[PDB]
């Protein structure tokens, strides 16, 4: 279940394996949103295949129509948008990612990362390969909680070993091309949190 411009089509496990073959790394961005964060990641690193997952295709149409253009007009060969939700990830993505990111999640996905929801995070952990680097960047209102043993033990029980926790400012977030990230970055002073480590 992927997007070819504004049209939804199927991609089989084989086809995907074939594509991933021409790359040394595969990164997955969950709840990718409007696909801009992923777009910038890919354009700056042609040695990685980027998979942006999101349950709402309407928000992906623009970038989706753009990545499919010829390279001369902003097209990209290392991107694919998957239409799925954290509650039910596609089995084809099992044990495939070298790295995973969840950037500025909203709604239920934010809840799953913050609570945390061990079951849901467990399913996300299944998308990563043995190595697997991960990054969770969140914000709620405009750091000790994430460094607590409780949160650390729960994420660990889900397959996520925290190596670092950092509090980022608007200045940093101003770097993201996401319209959602920019609204967040350009507004009131706000606190951002990045929990990162390995699977």
DSSP 59-79: GGHHHHHHHTS-GGGT--SSE
Resolution, expressed in angstroms to one decimal: 2.4
Radius of gyration of the chain (CA): 16
Q: Identify the H or E element spanning 164.
A: strand 161-168
Is 104 annotated as contributing to ligand binding?
Answer: yes
Q: Is 169 part of any known ligand binding site? A: no
8 Å CB contact between 81 and 120: no
Beta-bridged to residue 52, according to DSSP, are: 29, 81
186 labelled as ligand-binding? no
Whether 135 has a binding-site annotation, put simply, is: no
DSSP state of 39: H
Q: How far apart are CA 12 and CA 182, in angstroms?
A: 35
Q: Is 178 annotated as a binding residue?
A: yes
117 marked among binding-site residues: no
Consult the annotation and say whether 153 binds a ligand: no
Would the annotation count 41 as a binding residue? no
Structure-determination technique: X-ray
Establish whether 72 is an annotated binding residue: no
Encoding tokens for residue 10? 């199927």
Q: Are 118 and 151 in contact (CB under 8 A)?
A: no
What tokens were used for 102? 């969840």
Q: Where are the domains of the chain?
A: 1-199
- CATH class of residue range 1-199: alpha beta
> Residues 6 or more apart from 44 whose CB is under 8 A from it?
none
Tokens of 106: 């909203």
Q: How far apart are CA 107 and CA 169, in angstroms?
A: 22
DSSP state for residue 35 in the 8-state scheme: S
Q: Are strands 25-30 and 97-103 parallel, antiparallel or unpaired?
A: parallel
């Amino acid at each position: 279940l992927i997007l070819k411009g504004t049209k939804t089509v199927d991609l089989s496990k084989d086809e995907l394996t074939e594509i991933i073959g021409q790359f040394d790394r595969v990164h997955i961005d969950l709840g990718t949103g409007d696909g801009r964060n992923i777009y910038k990641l890919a354009i700056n690193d042609q040695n990685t295949f980027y998979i942006g997952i999101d349950p709402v295709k309407e928000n992906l149409f623009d970038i989706s129509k753009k990545i499919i253009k010829k390279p001369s007009k902003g097209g990209l060969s290392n991107v694919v948008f998957v239409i799925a939700a954290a509650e039910s990830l596609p089995f084809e993505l099992k044990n495939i990612a070298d790295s995973i990111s969840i950037l500025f999640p909203w709604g239920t996905l934010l809840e799953y990362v913050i609570k945390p929801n061990r079951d849901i995070l467990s399913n996300v952990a299944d998308l990563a390969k043995k190595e697997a680097h991960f990054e969770f960047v969140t914000t709620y209102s405009d750091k000790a909680y994430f460094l607590s043993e409780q949160y650390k033990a729960e994420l660990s029980n889900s397959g996520f070993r925290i190596d670092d926790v950092k509090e980022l400012d608007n200045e940093y977030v101003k770097q993201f091309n996401s319209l959602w990230a920019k609204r967040l970055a350009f507004g009131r002073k706000r606190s951002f949190f990045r929990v990162s480590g390995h699977v």
